[PDB]
């Protein structure tokens, strides 16, 4: 399983073009394998997806005192616990997604608030990041709290703080997880002070959902995800195992919040940046907006099908933005062939999602913002198989349906109500982004003016 | 002038204890000299202070289109321009300082707001950084705008943001200034897009002070620094030179804001952190507060002289906090002896202020929070010569008088009104800080409860 | 002149990215003083050939100053574009031509050195060894012939000290040389405590100084010069008026020093790549020997003339140089006045880095850039061809002085060795790496090989 | 067990900080798996002596797996605390003593090697050279004597191969050894393409394998063993019941391999420090020679017995060791069960780093820790004393096996040399560095010296 003997994506590109698509890091120690084709990624996550759906250990789990059946989804290990919970959330997001417009309602009204909040800046320039976080966040709060939050609500502002800083604390641990061993089984616990904010963030949910159980009517069909969880807690009251505890509830919600907010929010931030950066495209999206939705009604999901160019654009934002370059890290559950190579049980798989998204041999102009990628000769939307921002296989993103929804509803709502540009003095912002395990656009401010 | 042939502070300590106090970096290319004693620093900045008050070139000045007589103070080069302006600001801070309690007025009321703002969190935990930035910022706003700003004011929120990100943008250029050559005289100007936020920040001042210009009564004694500047402008209208332009006004204010806010704010953050970290000391400070000021009246500058322990404490916060470890970077105006060594005209001097503040041969417990450092056998305040957080000599900090004020007034006002602790679940924060050209405490939250 | 802007140890897999993000010409340190990296064959040709007269300057380095170079007492390698370097480039090309062809002088010296190298190999009796130290002695001796009159016994203590001195001195200068992709000249007057830094480079000059001092005593002033030193001494008389002119004692020893360092390690390392690849592709080795037996035979010594009739060996030798790719960034250049390349203005006094590797491994030029593939140099009929992308010695007014002598060394040593021996990996051993350790000079990772007669 | 917490090559001047911020015992990687750095003399003694039992384990390294170690076919150096290592520590200390002064065996072999070394030096005729290669040969030969019966001619191709193999092989292993301040064991089954990584270490085993195979032909099974291999072979006979027992052919060559690598480089590098400091402090050189002429004279060969009557030379040699400080971090240890040092709990299986440098250069112990200062070892009357802080060979159940033989080598080689020659810096040259290049082994930066008779 190749690789050499003795900042990271522009780096992996070299190793790829020296070693092929599948290659090994740390051959001599414990091998960590980097998957690079669309071909390589599909083979590992789809073809052998059941055996590569495990998560490599991280001290986060231990530090936060996870254990038995009290891990979330994100870092949960392949086993009953995770399967239980992947099951529950996909079930729950499909019932609420369609069902009685529940998820749609919550999003569309959140868009209306976001629009209000933008409008409140009176075309005086600002940076849309904080607002984009609140909006996206609220959608998850609806899903898991019953309520949405006032943008100025101190509780909400604390929650956001808690979820942001908790997430910078864990990415420390998460990037090192491209090498060293599990943890001495028993981390020092002085290790406590390291996830302060992550732990503080659990504590605040713990209570927000404690007061939600008080609201909840046990003798009626569940209204949101928490309620559907609590209900399921009843069925399983017997079972000494089963991952439906109070313990797990808050982690699950915590996961949804972190995994959910920042990814959707950051994308919309690339969206807006690219919109002011290619006003050509912006007009055309709005041209289509006025033709299909008009200026009176609220954009709804049904419009999506009739909106080739907007759809195309949204997808190109995702592919050019390329926000989670290495996705999240996997581990084998038993040995496995990929492209001929033996890959032993327990092995770190790094899934170079960026290499698929920016594949030179797939996309007409991989390093350019180019909505054509998604448009056929007639201007119908098409989506290449290389389109994998939410990854693929057993462990692909839980949120995909809700995110597809958020990106379409927020993005249109905004381009319907406003025209975005670069502030009239300013020298015009960068295409390139700052590269963590999550890539944001470098800070820009924009103007929003009505039409 | 010694040094070796072919992180940074724990690093220089080695080279010190291998090469002595004055040593050279880049001996073979262009030598950059690092000054290390209290002895070494005093000899360079005080003794030869007139020849070492120059600032090494940076692309910032060029990029922002500084030039003739249109640099501020901070990055201004040794010459008429900077002299003119150091002059003007020390004069102005001295008159406003005592004069008619102007600066004291502005500070004490700002402390009252800060206290209000804290009290608005109802003992539910928060991190004080944002509030500490607003308060300190307002003091500069008073100095330079006439009024203060509502904490929730969108213009103010934009201003702070602009001053923050613009300062992050410049510290990139500022830490590289421990090596490579000036700039090709004519930077690429595509280099524009690099200081977007610093430039955006100037533009917003430009208009905040433009509307002050109209408020201002030219036939009366100037009320604040801007006014005093404008007065001095009409005066020098003759002189084709003179640094009293519109051009320079905004850079000067910009300098005051950036140099002023973040330093004072960060210190107070270290203050509160150390307060909740050593409740022992907190009580004692409050013991004195109750004895000297009481529970009715607002702490005023006069009280300082009667408050040995609080003074001691505030100073130990500064010394342990050690926020600007390398100070700001200097350059020789002509050759110079220090500790025997020839130091050619045009030479980067790095002033290891941390090595002075944490001098092992000077302080009884350099790496510990220890207010005794400043208390004699009878518990009178004393200040060692090694106390140099504002540096020393020709180019020491302009703000020192206003900062001493800010620290005393804010810090006491707060410990008079509240008791600070670590949130009741939480594992208790770190002594150690994140090391840029400015060192902050790692993020902590605290509770503020009345007494 | 493009390149990335900030907010912010090995470098060629790195430049490949910046190339495919910024195009072929790009800038490092845009905001400070720009350093420009040339990437195409197109980009390189345009700077070093088209504007060659304005890009043939060398960027300052503390080496010159530390070694107390100055007026007309710099060598060729680090000499600054001016009368001095011009003077000396011309002398050495003149001198290498005359001796090259002339009376088989250079050929004679190389062939017999091959004969010793072969003897040295044969003395290991098929028991494995690494060929590096022998390859350094042989190559070195060719330069010793050029500049000292005689060759050296492989066990000679003076020789062994010389090689030691030239190796470590070269190790001391590469420190300075890699940093020369950024900071300013030197305070005009380096600290001189800076002495202790080139100890071995200085020691190496002192020993030459003395080997050539005793050559001067041998030299017959009233007869045609027999080697490069002699032709230098003659030219020194000629100029004994001129207060300027770079023909001093001062400059002699630097010039030789340059020839020794530039010359030995480069040729030597290539031959090391040659043998490694030979044992690594025994397929090719047989074919080269097939040809050898056809053209030269088993009795006479390979000579330069055979080269023309040996397509496949030529091909191979060239593919060794291209895959080996030993001096990836070449040596560093500087503009003498502004210049445009690919549309871009490039100001007087500017560090040019010439990415030779990017030309040699050009994806858009070579069928299989990352593979050992002699076909690169063979047409459909199996005649030797050389693409324009073949630039291991670089190009333009400052391209390698040594090219004719090195073409000669590679051909003669490499054939001589494949004529007499068969090389292979020692019988237990796991088989060595294609990849090499990346200094400003890239070697093969250490391997040992067996040399058995045929 | 203290140490810093996060959010985020040249490591000893680094540890000094953490020491003076966290105390003597502190933790690396608290949040992952803790690695503990011992700093006092106090901290080191407590761990290695007091709990020496339970800290005598070696942390896993891919080296063992890669070299196909396994059951009880590990050497001593990397061997894991167990029957295997106990067996073999015991065999080597037993054997080194019997040979130490039983019948002057070890002494005879060292003293004659000194006499060759002296000849080899003398053969450079006062013309300058660097003593490193010769220092490696001599030290190496002592080990050859112990393990091959033979010594080797300094020009012997086999010997030259062997040294080459033992150097590069040791280069290759220090890659692995310095990462062993963090990441996990190895996937139990390393990729084996991992083969190509220790080529030279494996090549080195193979050559011993067959130097010692021809030793067994020589060896007379019905007589008292005359060196370490022979003693091993006899012990192998007796254990040819026991299915376990570490006395195999398998283990023999690793044991020798260990003795060669551990042994040669350390002793050789010290002597290199010794000579460098001698030319660097000619003041001290004369005084050592003054003592030499007083005690040994100019006729007879220095012998071990002279050591007792030679306070100043002893002092000096010890100061060379302390100042030189060649293995700064020693070798890395691991706990066999939990353990409480300076109050702190240290869990079963934990990487202990023993900062030997911090003990040798302890500021609170040595009058002038950063200066070459033989007084450290001389009392008020000029009797030799040795502080407890003198720990170059470390301490405890896993302290250096070679100490007696090393003490011997240092005295005999060092005196022999200073008796016959006077060492100085070459007459042109600017005079070398006190400071050294910092691997897991610290050498003096390359210097050359002159040896002239007296
Ligand atoms: C454009 C917005 C989003 C993007 C680009 C995105 C992308 C991803 C990616 C790449 C993964 C890694 C899957 C793997 O390990 O192969 C992931 C996992 C995950 N995501 Fe998303 N996501 C987005 C929105 C959301 C939101 C809205 C939610 C919840 C509301 C969510 C919840 C999750 C969860 C729970 C996982 C862990 C999956 C598991 O461990 O079973 N994501 N996401
Ligand atoms: C505890 C709060 C503060 C600290 C620790 C501090 C520290 C420093 C330091 C170390 C320098 C570098 C001087 C040198 O180059 O050697 C400096 C310069 C400067 N500071 Fe402060 N400062 C503080 C507050 C302030 C405030 C409140 C102001 C204005 C309101 C201010 C304005 C300036 C200016 C304009 C300079 C540039 C001096 C010149 O270039 O002439 N500082 N300060
Ligand atoms: C395969 C063996 C060799 C290779 C690959 C090689 C390559 C090079 C390269 C890349 C340069 C840099 C030119 C530039 O600045 O663009 C150079 C320069 C030079 N080479 Fe070589 N060379 C080899 C053998 C030799 C030998 C045998 C000699 C002399 C015996 C020699 C003498 C020189 C000299 C004196 C320069 C400096 C040119 C100047 O500044 O005018 N080279 N060589
Ligand atoms: C000045 C010469 C030498 C020095 C400074 C030296 C130093 C050391 C040190 C620091 C250790 C590490 C012990 C530990 O783990 O704490 C060690 C171990 C060892 N040394 Fe030496 N050594 C020297 C000479 C020798 C020689 C001459 C031999 C054999 C001829 C030798 C054989 C060994 C062996 C086999 C070990 C491993 C001990 C074990 O794992 O049980 N050393 N040495």
Question: Which residue matches tokens 């005592």?
Answer: B98
* DSSP element (H, E) containing D26: strand D26-28
**CB atoms closer than 10 angstroms to residue C105:** 16
Three-class SS state of D52:
helix
Question: What CATH superfamily classification does D1-454 receive?
Answer: Cytochrome P450 (1.10.630.10)
Q: By the 8 A CB rule, do A3 and A25 touch?
A: yes
Residues A276, A420 contacting (CB under 8 angstroms)? yes
Closest by CA to D274, choosing from D111, D382, D392, D145, is D392
- Residues A103, A106, A111: CA angle, nearest 5 degrees: 120
Distant-in-sequence, close-in-space partners of D285: CB < 8 Å, separation ≥ 6: D278, D279, D418, D422, D423
Q: Are A90 and A390 in contact (CB under 8 A)?
A: no
**Residue numbers in B near A432 (CB within 8 A):** none
**3-state DSSP call for residue C423?**
strand
Domain boundaries, chain A: 1-451
Specify the DSSP class assigned to residue B47.
I
The answer to whether A44 and A342 are in contact (CB under 8 A) is no
Which chains are adjacent to chain A, needing at least 3 Cβ pairs under 8 Å?
A: B, C, D
Tell me, letter by letter, the H, E, C secondary structure of chain A: CCCCCCCCHHHHHHHHHHHCCCEEECCCCCCEEEECCHHHHHHHHHHCCCCCCECCCCHHHHHCCCCCCCCCCCCCCCCHHHHHHHHHHHHHHHHHHCCCCHHHHHHHHHHHHHHHHHHCCCCCCECCHHHHHHHHHHHHHHHHHCCCCCCCCHHHHHHHHHHHHHHHHHHHHHHHHHCCCCCCCCCCCHHHHHCHHHHHHHHHHHHHHHHHHHHCCCCCCCCCHHHHHHHHHHHCCCCCCCCCCHHHHHHHHHHHHHHHHHHHHHHHHHHHHHHHHCHHHHHHHHHHHHHHCCCCCCCCHHHHHHCHHHHHHHHHHHHHHCCCCCCCCEECCCCCEECCEECCCCCEEEECHHHHHCCCCCCCCCCCCCHHHHECCCCCECCCCCCCCCCCCCCCCCCHHHHHHHHHHHHHHHHHHEEEECCCCCCCCCCCEEECCCEEECCCCEEEEEC
| D neighbours by CB contacts (3+ pairs under 8 Å) | A, B, C
SS3 assignment, position C344: strand
Taking the CA of B141 as reference, the closest ligand is 2
Tokens (6 digits) for D270: 């010290």
Neighbours of D119 (CB within 10 A): 11
* DSSP three-state, residue B109: helix
Q: Is the CB of C258 under 6 A from ligand 3?
A: yes
- The CA-atom distances, in angstroms, between A332 and each of A28, A40, A174, A393 are 18, 15, 17, 14
Ligand 1: residues with CB < 6 A are A 73-74, 86, 140, 255-256, 259-260, 263-264, 267, 323-324, 327-328, 389-391, 395-399, 402-403
Q: How far is the CA of B85 from the centre of ligand 2 (A)?
A: 14
Q: Do residues B373 and B316 lie in contact, with contact meaning Cβ atoms separated by under 8 Å?
A: yes
Q: Which of D126, D129, D204, D430 to mutate to test the interface with C (most CBs of C within 10 A)?
A: D430
Which residues does residue C450 pair with via DSSP β-bridges, in sequence order? C424
Chain D nearest CA to A405, separation (Å)? 34
Mutate one of B427, B432, B440, B444 to test the A interface: name it (highest A CB count within 10 A): B427
Of C7, C16, C435, the CB nearest to A14: C16
C198 touches chain B (CB under 8 A): no
Listed by number, the residues of chain A in 176-195 with a beta carbon closer than 8 Å to a beta carbon of chain B are: 192-193
Residues A8-13: contacts with CB within 8 Å, 24+ apart? A8/A326, A9/A325, A9/A326, A9/A352, A9/A354, A9/A355, A9/A435, A10/C14, A10/C17, A10/C21, A11/C13, A12/A36, A12/A352, A12/A355, A13/A355, A13/C17
- DSSP secondary structure string for all residues of B161-179: HHHHHHHHHHHHHHHSTTS
Query: Do D447 and D271 touch, CB atoms closer than 8 A?
Result: no
Give burial (CB, 10 Å; 0-12/13-18/19+) of C83: exposed
Given in angstroms, what resolution was this structure solved at? Answer: 3.0
CB-based burial label for D262 (10 Å; 0-12, 13-18, 19+): buried
DSSP β-ladder status, A341-342 and C450-453: unpaired
Neighbours of A295 (CB within 10 A): 9
Q: Which residues pair with B440 in a beta bridge?
A: B434
Strand partners, A351: A35
User: Who's near D45: CB < 8 A, 6+ residues apart?
Assistant: D388, D395
Residue of chain B whose Cα is closest to the Cα of A168: B443
The SS3 of residue C94 is helix
Which residues of chain B does C182 touch, with a Cβ-Cβ cutoff of 8 Å? 179-180
Burial of D379 (0-12, 13-18, 19+ CB in 10 A): exposed
| C-beta of D401 in contact with ligand 4 (< 6 A) | yes
Nearest CB neighbour to D4, from listed B13, B18, B432: B432
CA-nearest of C395, C388, C309 to C352 is C395
Q: Smallest Cα–Cα separation from B202: which of B234, B145, B264, B249?
A: B249
Binding site membership of C398 for ligand 3 (Cβ less than 6 Å): yes
* d(CA C359, ligand 3 centre) in Å: 17
Q: Are B437 and B351 in contact (CB under 8 A)?
A: no
Handedness of CA A291, A294, A295, A299 (dihedral sign): negative
Nearest to D76 by CA among D406, D402, D439, D350: D402
Q: Residue D279: count other Cβ atoms within 10 Å of its Cβ.
A: 20
D427 interfaces chain C, CB cutoff of 8 Å? no
DSSP state of C39: -
A10: distance to nearest CA of chain C, Å?
6
Q: Which residues of B sit in the known binding site for substrate?
A: 255
Count of beta carbons in the 10 Å neighbourhood of residue B418: 21
Cα of C160 to nearest chain D Cα, Å? 10
In degrees, rounded to 5, the angle at the alpha carbon of residue B24 between the alpha carbons of residues B21 and B28 is: 160
- Among residues A87, A131, A27, A104, the alpha carbon closest in space to that of A341 is found at A27
CB of residue C143 inside a 6 A radius of ligand 3? yes
Q: What's the CA gap between B329 and C19, in Å, rounded?
A: 35
Strand partners, A440: A434
Q: Residue A343: which of A330, A353, A332, A328 has the closest Cα?
A: A332
Residue D329 φ/ψ, nearest 5 degrees: -105, 5
Nearest chain B residue to C178, by CA = B6
Q: Using CA atoms, how far apart are residues B346 and C248, in angstroms rounded to an integer? A: 36
The dihedral of CA C264, C265, C268, C270: what is its sign? negative
If you compute the radius of gyration of chain C from its CA atoms, what whole number of angstroms results?
Answer: 22
Q: How far apart are CA D101 and CA D90, in angstroms?
A: 18
Which residues make Cβ contacts (< 8 Å) with residue D174, sequence separation at least 6?
D439, D440, D441
Test the D interface: residue of A29, A174, A191 with most D CBs within 10 Å:
A29
User: How many residues does this entry show for chain C?
Assistant: 454
Is C26 in contact with C53 (CB distance < 8 Å)? no
CB C69 within 8 A of CB C254: yes
Q: Which atom of ligand 2 is nearest to the CA of B75?
A: 40
CB-closest option in A27, A181, A186 to D183: A181
CA distance C100 to C106: 5
Contact C21 A367 (CB under 8 A): yes
Contact B172 C62 (CB under 8 A): no
The class level of CATH for A1-451 reads: mainly alpha
Please enumerate, by residue number, every residue of B annotated as part of a binding site. Answer: 255, 397
């Amino acid at each position: 399983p190749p690789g050499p003997l003795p900042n990271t994506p522009y780096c992996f590109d070299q190793l790829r073009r020296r070693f092929g698509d599948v290659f090994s890091l740390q051959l001599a120690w414990t091998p960590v394998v980097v998957l690079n084709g669309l071909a390589a990624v599909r083979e590992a996550l789809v073809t052998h997806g059941e055996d590569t759906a495990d998560r490599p250990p991280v001290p986060i789990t231990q530090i936060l005192g996870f254990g038995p059946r009290s891990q979330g989804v994100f870092l949960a290990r392949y086993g009953p616990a995770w399967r239980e919970q992947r099951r529950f959330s996909v079930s729950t997001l499909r019932n609420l997604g369609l069902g009685k417009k529940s998820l749609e309602q919550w999003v569309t009204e959140e868009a209306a608030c976001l629009c209000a909040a933008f409008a409140n800046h009176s075309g005086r320039p600002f940076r849309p990041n904080g607002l984009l976080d609140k909006a996206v966040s609220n959608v998850i709060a609806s899903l898991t709290c019953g309520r949405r939050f006032e943008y100025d609500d101190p509780r909400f502002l604390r929650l956001l703080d808690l979820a942001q800083e908790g997430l910078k604390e864990e990415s420390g641990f998460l990037r090192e997880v491209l090498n060293a061993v599990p943890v001495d089984r028993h981390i020092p616990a002085l290790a406590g002070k390291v996830l302060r904010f992550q732990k503080a963030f659990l504590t605040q949910l713990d209570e927000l959902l404690t007061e939600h159980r008080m609201t909840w009517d046990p003798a009626q069909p569940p209204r949101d995800l928490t309620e559907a969880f609590l209900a399921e807690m009843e069925k399983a009251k017997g079972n000494p195992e089963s991952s439906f505890n109070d313990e797990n509830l808050r982690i699950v919600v915590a996961d949804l919040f972190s995994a959910g907010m920042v990814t959707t929010s950051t994308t919309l931030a690339w969206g807006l940046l690219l919109m002011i950066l290619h006003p050509d495209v912006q007009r055309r999206v709005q041209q289509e907006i006025d033709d299909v939705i008009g200026q009176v009604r609220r954009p709804e999901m049904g419009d999506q099908a009739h909106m080739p160019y907007t759809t195309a654009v949204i997808h190109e934002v995702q592919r050019f933005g390329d926000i989670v370059p290495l996705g999240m890290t996997h581990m084998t559950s038993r040995d496995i062939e990929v492209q001929g190579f033996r890959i032993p049980k327990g092995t770190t798989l790094i899934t170079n999602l960026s290499s698929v998204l920016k594949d030179e041999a797939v996309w007409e102009k991989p390093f350019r913002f180019h909505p054509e990628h998604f448009l056929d000769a007639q201007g119908h939307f098409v989506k290449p198989e290389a389109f994998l921002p939410f990854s693929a296989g057993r462990r692909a993103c839980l949120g995909e349906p809700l995110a597809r929804m958020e990106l379409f509803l927020f993005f249109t709502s905004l381009l319907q109500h406003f025209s975005f540009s670069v502030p009239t003095g300013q020298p015009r912002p960068s295409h390139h982004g700052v590269f963590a395990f999550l890539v944001s656009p470098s800070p820009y401010e924009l103007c929003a003016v009505p039409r």
